[PDB]
């Protein structure tokens, strides 16, 4: 078998290679509202956010749903525009949300009147349609809401109990606006724009940092859905709200991105084993008269202390209202995050903020001791609680009793969906006694407890996946992976009598769906590995025979695949039985006009951490084109998903726990040592690895565990020391240092710099310079022991960029510098002459 | 003409032959004691602080003087231990003053008592020899002063009118403590602590960053040399003081040497075109009663600010007493640094700190419009002053008249000594009329203004080099480069009928001199190319016909040179005819063991920058040993000084005025060709280029502007973009940013980097990460050009070190890098097939 030399061109060459190789966000957020026009041709409008095309903001657009389609022919709906033609702040929600694009982010709805309110830039807006007023045949001017606050607006809200008032934040603290009176009214005073944050360390209605990046936490209130009416003929308009005190976390330094100033921004930073902020639970209070005058503002503090109403509470998680409003809800952690709960909370649980040590009593002892937090659900485990946004609540049928959806990996290490009916009883714990509630005092017993599904598969409950209930039929609608792991598929079930799973969706592609409110359509958008992705409209209807049983039709096309790209060959998917117990699922790019008797080198490209899946049934060709230009030029490419990726259950996921970095190269060299065992172009003698965060932490562990497999390794944005990272992600997966010496020890590769080999060409380390999410610092720390411990390295910075590449000019820079690298360390001739 | 190519070594071989080849301060602050003992064989006793051997402490020795000596055989005086066996404030002292050792750096001495004052680490100790009490025949134990500061104590200094004080720095503020008594006082209160240095920018008796870091200033403050009686019985100290307010100063933030922080320090640094810190004169007053106890302090301010009395002042460069005490003396510079004066500040412009406007109104009528400041002397240069330490003050004859020395290149462009008489005239401005001074109101009559030396040579004054007064014999000793340009020597001359300069050391040789207080005595350092430093004593005596004649004599060796190193083969200086109009002087390795029909790979080491001079008559088989280890691989290596360099005039200096960067790579590459001229071993296709600060700049704008020319340039913490560095060193060479648009543009090699090679393995850039001299956002900022302008780059960063290197691991690892860097990318053959 003869080695395959790439052929070697210039550092000038390979960028008009990757310059001519070189030369649009899907609709999305949709929303369908009935037309109720009996005479009129449509039955629905639906509203979404799309890119008008190739290079452009985000905004809204509709499309008219027809009451019948030519079943001959294929619908395409055409796009209306709804509507007529970067702070810190915003920088920092872009980095956390992973928004690459521009313009309108996400949109509210208020459907009793119509309004739209949305963020566009530095302006709140807001325009109305589908409500009673009607439905508008030409685009909308945005209304901009006029402010007199100085400072970004972020976060703003519709009050669903009336779409006169919107809520936003303003320097960290809530405030109210009316879109009619134009009446603004600040209602938290909890923190100064004008001090140091040194000195300012409170926040409200905000999600902190750990929260927004390790919970998809983005906002820290929540409008009660339903006003109260008071005798004068006004109203009270309520909000929960999360406040945060970061006065004893810790400040780190990150690299202003003005290089000119030569200073650096301070940053709130929990690493691991370290605070995380006090929080607690407020309430704020509007009463408002006839004419939607605020009358005062009454701002209210929890009876008794967060950590004695809510005993080892770490985290809220998540937080909102009951649908009529009688409750505010909140899913809870604990530190460990192996406890999760369920509690309703009152507002007859608030009293107003007092200093008068007097009436401040007076107020205590008004409130009832039956009036309690209720735990109506409470799970544990031993590996971790996955965090998802499915929570439904029924109507309240019963005086005393609370109905709702969840879904759980607790009870079979698969997440599945649960119809769970809590009892509402007294408290035996009275706080006039004077004392602390024992460990189960507010623990609701459980009436009913139902699994609606069950198997080998997961119910998929993030990035947008979560259920639609049909309360009529009384059906839910779900993603899942029933028919395979490489898929995700939409399913529908009932909750009534659950049974068989009907797929909605068709084999031989992965789906991302959006159900109307309605239950009437669903979309999907579907790709497979040859096919880039569709956007597509499908009617749902009943058989006569029973109304339970659901079949699909398409209706219309929203977006039309371009086809197979002329210059892509997609990768075969591959798997193989591992020692491990488990089918591991990987990826092959061939070598393009594979020559026969030769052997070509390789690069495995990594990320293997959890809270991904690389290897699975979609298109790969936009952002893992560069595999295909790889395998273009005489590289084999290779991508494995090793135990701790996601999609495949609780006990795969928790393979690593405890040992992150211990088990990951031990899978991906089993899949290499499988492929070149059925494939003799592999040549085993020239193996790269390449990857980033998570996978150029692997990059470094697979040159330090296995230089007998791995000839070079690039490392982009690595963690280096897991005491660096924080402590939501990291104390998951790993647990308090205290009680895990070994593992961080073995898991940190900056603590094993002399295990790096003594010959240079074989570790690259690249990293953007600004990183707020792995800290320069990884990079640096590691670069001090490997000077320390007399080994060579290569490093490139990247210094306008976070843990991102978002400037096209820092992206072609890397793609070439890594493209050189392989050529000049892997691929070429020369590469081979220089191995000493 | 054959290319040789150099062996190609592994990474573990090249370390370890580094370390095979890698397998002592000498003594200096030399002072002479009589020992008065007409019976006694000894005349004299030396003081010195040394390292007693190759790693160890510097500690104080004294030696004996004998009377006669054999002047058959050679004395070593034996070395006699005087002393019985770090804080961020020391750390940045030790970067200001490039300190590279551990111990006593220098020492205190007040000759009437005997008493020696010391800083050993964090204490301050005291103890006794060659007063009145006599002299020790075995080691002293050190005294510590005792102390309730809490924080470090810096920069104490013995009261020359009472040696029962001495003064030191404590968190910015000037304390005395008696060292008999134990009394400690605090005397100015101008900083806090506890506070942030955002909040309290203000410090006494200290020298801030420019000053320190350009000016070779590091103290604040200046004890009175005499004390005045009071008619109680007790006294009057005075401290002169600077008193400095940094508030409008930039502040940047450079990275904690603790990484595991991810923290910076906040660092007040002047920029070019930005606010030095607002600077005045303050005077201590110290009533103390007749038993040696504090009465009162009493704090004093100028009559009239600053910025009045002396107009047009930025720095003050320097700062003392007259001889006797009437008048405090001050060199001011302006902002151009192109206007020196020397002013007299009587006592009496001082008056008390009053917050009471009626009380200060009475104190400022209460002084006469006669005491006024007092220009001695006032020079004006279109080039620039370059401050020194010579100023002599004789002692005062007649009443309104001050005779002195100064040395100044403003007259000839050649640093020479000028013995000048000032008339102190009664001043026409009255500030009691209520109007500002003219321009010329303070300035003296000059009586008489005499030429001491002349000529094309220079006197030294910096880095130790200083002059010594004979006021009986009426001569000066001096050192300068009369003789030759490559070497220093010791000369006298008579400052009264000025004329025949005799010099006094011995041609072939380098010399670093200390003469004797008493003028009989000098100490030569000195080495040559071939010799390694040694250091002797030799005694002065005049033939008894003419007592200004002066001649040398052999009397002891103090420190033996080793010899020649058994493994290093000395440089060759050669020098050419520049079409610039000067000989431009250089230092060529040949490569060892010289094959006949073969040419080399070449590396030329440079600085290039201003205040530097690397070719001379001196031993550099310690600093650039690694020199010898290019040529004993098979480099030519090259040293060339171009024009900008010292020791040849203010002209050759100042040849770079407003165009830094623009004419050193002309001379370094007529250098080249000279050499590759006369010498066909040099092969002028395979050049690379190295320096570290201005050489690392050069390095790269060589690469910049000469491709033609350098293959590789390697550059070591480089300035990129001129705005970032400070005003002191700046300003003086390339003006105000306003005033030199295309300098600082074309100056800066950042704002060029669509001008670098679209080419690898040609440019490497090393810089210590936490550099606060030449901050690592010049590399940090070229790299962000460089990315944008698609250029390829390496980089190795020192996470530990500052602008120096001072950790031996970080050492090690560079100089592998850089040898194993040369070897891939231009002396082996396998950086000959790499070439595209
Ligand atoms: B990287 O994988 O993007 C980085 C290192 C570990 C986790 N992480 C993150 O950016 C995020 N915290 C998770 C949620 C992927
Ligand atoms: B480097 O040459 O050490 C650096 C860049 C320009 C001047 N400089 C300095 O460190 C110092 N400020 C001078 C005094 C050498
Ligand atoms: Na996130
Ligand atoms: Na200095």
Redesign the interface.
Known sequence: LEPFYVE?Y???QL?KLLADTRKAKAPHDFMFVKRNDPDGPHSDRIYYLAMSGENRENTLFYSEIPKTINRAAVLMLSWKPLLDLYSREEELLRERKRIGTVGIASYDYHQGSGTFLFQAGSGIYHVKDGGPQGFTQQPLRPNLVETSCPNIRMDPKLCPADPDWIAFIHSNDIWISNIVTREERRLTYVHNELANMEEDARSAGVATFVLQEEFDRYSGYWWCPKAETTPSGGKILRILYEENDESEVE???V?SPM??????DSFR?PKTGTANPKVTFKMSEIMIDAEGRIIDVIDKELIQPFEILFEGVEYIARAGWTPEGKYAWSILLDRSQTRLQIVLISPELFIPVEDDVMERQRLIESVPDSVTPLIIYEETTDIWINIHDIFHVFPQSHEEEIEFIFASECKTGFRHLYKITSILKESKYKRSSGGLPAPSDFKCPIKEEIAITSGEWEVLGRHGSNIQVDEVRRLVYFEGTKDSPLEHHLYVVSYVNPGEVTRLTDRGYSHSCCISQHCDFFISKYSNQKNPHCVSLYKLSSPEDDPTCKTKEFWATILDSAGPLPDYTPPEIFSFESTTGFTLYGMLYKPHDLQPGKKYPTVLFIYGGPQVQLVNNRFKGVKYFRLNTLASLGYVVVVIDNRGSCHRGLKFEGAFKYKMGQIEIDDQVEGLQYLASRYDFIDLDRVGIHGWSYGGYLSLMALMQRSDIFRVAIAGAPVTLW??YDTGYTERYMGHPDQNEQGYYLGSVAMQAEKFP???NRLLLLHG?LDENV?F?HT??L??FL??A?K?????????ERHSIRVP??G??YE??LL?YLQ?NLGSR?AA??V?
């Open positions: 070697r210039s550092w000038s960028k400040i780190i330094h690299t290089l000119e100033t030569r200073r650096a930073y005491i660096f003594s010959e240079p310079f800290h610092a640096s720390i670069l001090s000077v320390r007399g060579p390295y290569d490093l490139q910075i990247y210094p306008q000019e820092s072609e820079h070439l510098h050189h000049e020369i002459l220089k000493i």
